[PDB]
């Protein structure tokens, strides 16, 4: 959005020790951002753990299905022989 | 260091706090008046956008209701 | 209601650096109104998208009904002839 | 600044925030006393309006109850 | 409560630029009170409108009932003939 | 100035706002001590009313349960 | 808890103009206690009123039961004779 | 007014307010150091209490599960 | 997490009357933490009481069950004779 | 005061509050610039970390869909 840059250049023109206050505000913004991303990374870890458990569950289901199909085919072949 | 703030916001609450922070005395008052004027113009553009959106919404709603009424007639 | 206008003209008569503070406060107020305008635009965009979806669905079932009616009429005419 | 506020409020919370922020010594004290008197008069007018609302609501409720009894007699 | 008036009188006697602050703060109190007065006005207006709608619909059913009674008595009179 | 405040409190939150607003050094400390003492007297009276209400509630509840037991006996 | 008492004693040692601030703060907390006391008084009054009405209902029920029992016994005695 | 505060706290949120307001230069620094030390001591005592409570909770939980297993095998 | 220690060390170097304010803020934060400590000890006490009640109920149930089992064995012995 | 702070931190909003409060003029500006730089470096490190984590999550989800499709086709 160009409104952001327009406001930034308007502030720069108005300014032309405030730089110290700007730095402090930037540090506070960085702190807020780091808190938000801590939350996001924690929730994504939880989601990844859930997806991994789902993955192993469906892998077990696939193994069971393949084993059952192989057993049925083997017993059918034995009956045929 | 204003460029760092722009890159941080474009790399994405924070915007509103920055704006609230942003908000010779004769020159300062003149600059504040200029800022008020440009913000007022931007807000007028926003009003025009909202009016256009409302007009399109009304037109599409009348079209939808007319088509629904015609379909009910067709039954 | 003209009460707000009356109190504003009363405060202006009071006025005649305070005006700079008034301008700054109204600037903050219009910034909050800018936030409100952004929210309103988002809501209107969502409503417009939903309305477009509804109109396209209406055209779809209308076309279905017309096609069915034409098929019935054509088969009836062919049977009659 | 009066015209700008007038147009901003006619183009549509604005009143709430503006009048919230709204709130040589002899002159200012005297005119503030005058403003206080104006506010007292406005509040008295509003209380009179409240009393009128109370009276019309009471009359409307009584007539509705009487008509309820009228219908109950009619059956 | 007379205790409230006694405390107010004591504090005002102790106070007597203080009066200007007194008047400013009571103006703020007046604004806070007029907010709730506006809210109550709106609520009472809504209640009045609802009760008016109710009276109108009920007068309509009253007219229906009177018409039905007139029809019944006319039928009875015709049968008596 | 007291007339305006009593009119405002009797017009019907107002009490809370006025008390919040109410919230040479020796004279001021002495007079605020007197006001605090009046407040303590009021608070003690209201604590007495609380105690009396609690006692009456307990007695009435005991009577109620005794009468319920009496009715169950009377069956 | 004795911890609060010993910390108050330690700050009394600290003090030994703070008395005026202590007076103001106890005034404020006593205003808060007054609000809480008003709430408790209202709750107690409502509970007392409800219990009194329910007690009157109980009295009426017991009177009806005793009247019914007396009527039954008198009717039985009369029928016996 | 220490006696009044003691009476008020015994007669019973108030603690939070009084210790929120609670929190020459060299003497003040030394007494504040003493305050920090006594707060640290109380904190350590409370942490020991918390650890003991957690250990007892774990012991009761394992006793509950062991007794439930004994009941299940006793059937 | 080393950034917290790094910032604390940097601000200690910046300080080197700052120590008094730092200690005062530490005490304030300690009180704010004491609030949560009181909450947690209350919760732990409630959980401990609940677990004790469940333990006594369960061992009562177990002793009743073993008494019933002994009664059944005794009845079997009686019917055997 | 570093030892007290680290001991309080390791024993578990606490860090949030302590670093919110924690947040000649030439030396102060140099120190705050260094702090800003180290914050930016840490932010870059964690941003790389979250990018790798998002890539891993996306790959795991894609493989999840592929495995589900294979399982439903094998039937």
Author numbering:
A (entry chain T), C (entry chain V), E (entry chain N), G (entry chain P), I (entry chain R): 50 to 65, 105 to 169
B (entry chain U), D (entry chain M), F (entry chain O), H (entry chain Q), J (entry chain S): 33 to 44, 52 to 62, 103 to 154
Paste lines from the article.
Three capsid types have been recognized from the nuclei of herpesvirus-infected cells: empty A-capsids, scaffolding-containing B-capsids, and DNA-filled C-capsids. A unique portal vertex exists at a 12th I5 vertex through which the genome is translocated during assembly. A separate protein complex, the terminase, associates with the dodecameric portal and initiates genome packaging and the concurrent autoproteolytic cleavage of the scaffold.
The resultant atomic structures reveal not only the expected A-, B-, and C-capsids but also capsids with portal vertices similar to C-capsids but no resolvable genome in the capsid lumen, which we named D-capsids. We refer to these capsids as “D-capsids” because their C-capsid-like portal suggests they were originally C-capsids, but the absence of most of the genome indicates that they are degraded. Ten of the 12 monomers from the basket are linked to the turret helices, each of which consists of one long helix extending toward the portal cap and connecting to two smaller helices arranged in a small helical bundle. The two non-contributing portal monomers are presumably disordered or flexible beginning at their turret sequences. In C-capsids, D-capsids, and virions, the turret helices are fully extended, whereas in A- and B-capsids, they are retracted and positioned ~65 Å lower.
